[PDB]
UniProtKB/Swiss-Prot annotation:
Active site: H24 (proton acceptor), D168 (proton donor)
Organism this protein belongs to: Homo sapiens (Human)
From-to range in the entire protein, with total length: 858 to 1103 of 2511
Protein name (record): Fatty acid synthase
Organism superkingdom: Eukaryota
Tissue: Ubiquitous. Prominent expression in brain, lung, liver and mammary gland.
Note: The relatively low beta-ketoacyl synthase activity may be attributable to the low 4'-phosphopantetheine content of the protein.
Residue stretches making up the PKS/mFAS DH domain: 4-240
Annotated function: Fatty acid synthetase is a multifunctional enzyme that catalyzes the de novo biosynthesis of long-chain saturated fatty acids starting from acetyl-CoA and malonyl-CoA in the presence of NADPH. This multifunctional protein contains 7 catalytic activities and a site for the binding of the prosthetic group 4'-phosphopantetheine of the acyl carrier protein ([ACP]) domain.
Stretches the record annotates as N-terminal hotdog fold: 4-112
Length: 240
């Protein structure tokens, strides 16, 4: 089988292009987001195919997050992505330790219907007050929920050409309508489908020139859907 690999050096200090990750700090620890792993794996697959990420509709299956990755406040940590073609597998490691595994492959015939649904709101500040009370201290670059219903099953997400923070605000919504008390971190995701062509068509502009997308959470189907992203079967565990 063919194999491919790429190494991403993550620096969060004040002059780094990845300084925005300091706004993903949970109970005082800077944690690399689960959706940051999705992003670097997707980039590695595009790089292996000679495509841009926006040209690559993609499926993830059976994503398992084996441990959290703390980020350093100075210097760098290096995350390595390896892909194996025949099995469609990927692995992410850090200093030889396995961090994430699963399957990833191009979505050969995307179905735009996956991103549609049949057809009392909290403002942004109250949303992040609610998340703060539940234990999540997101800073401004991760405050992408612009409004959400009191039940947490619909809302609007900001789009800033950043797939990491956009998909993280989809996980934030799922947490919003939860009966769980306290801080919970992802441990696995059954499937993720991304179609950038649909994403571009789902975006719309508010009066303030902000590009946004509608988000819904289905308790019945165990899915969260926004723009061109469909997340199925999220599971989480308690953290201190």
């Amino acid at each position: 089988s063919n194999a491919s690999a790429a190494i991403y050096n993550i620096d969060t200090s004040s002059e780094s292009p990845d300084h925005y990750l300091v706004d993903h700090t949970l109970d005082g620890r800077v944690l690399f987001p689960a959706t940051g792993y999705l992003s670097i794996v997707w980039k590695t697959l595009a790089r292996a195919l000679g495509l841009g990420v926006e040209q690559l509709p993609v499926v993830f299956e059976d994503v398992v997050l084996h441990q959290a990755t703390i980020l350093p406040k100075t210097g760098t940590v290096s995350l390595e992505v390896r892909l194996l073609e025949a099995s469609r597998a990927f692995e992410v490691s850090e200093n030889g330790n396995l961090v994430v595994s699963g399957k990833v492959y191009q979505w050969d015939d995307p179905d735009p219907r996956l991103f549609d649904h049949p057809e009392l709101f909290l403002a942004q500040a109250e949303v992040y007050k609610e998340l703060r009370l539940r234990g999540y201290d997101y800073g401004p670059h991760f405050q992408g929920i612009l409004e959400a219903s009191l039940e947490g099953d619909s809302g609007r997400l900001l789009w800033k050409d950043n797939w990491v923070s956009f998909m993280d605000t989809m996980l934030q919504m799922s947490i919003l309508g939860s009966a769980k008390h306290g801080l919970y971190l992802p441990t696995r995701v059954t499937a993720i489908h991304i179609d950038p062509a649909t994403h571009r068509q789902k975006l719309y502009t508010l009066q303030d020139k902000a590009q946004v997308a509608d988000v819904v959470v289905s308790r019945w189907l165990r899915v969260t859907v926004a723009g061109g992203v469909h997340i199925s079967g999220l599971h989480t565990e308690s953290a201190p």
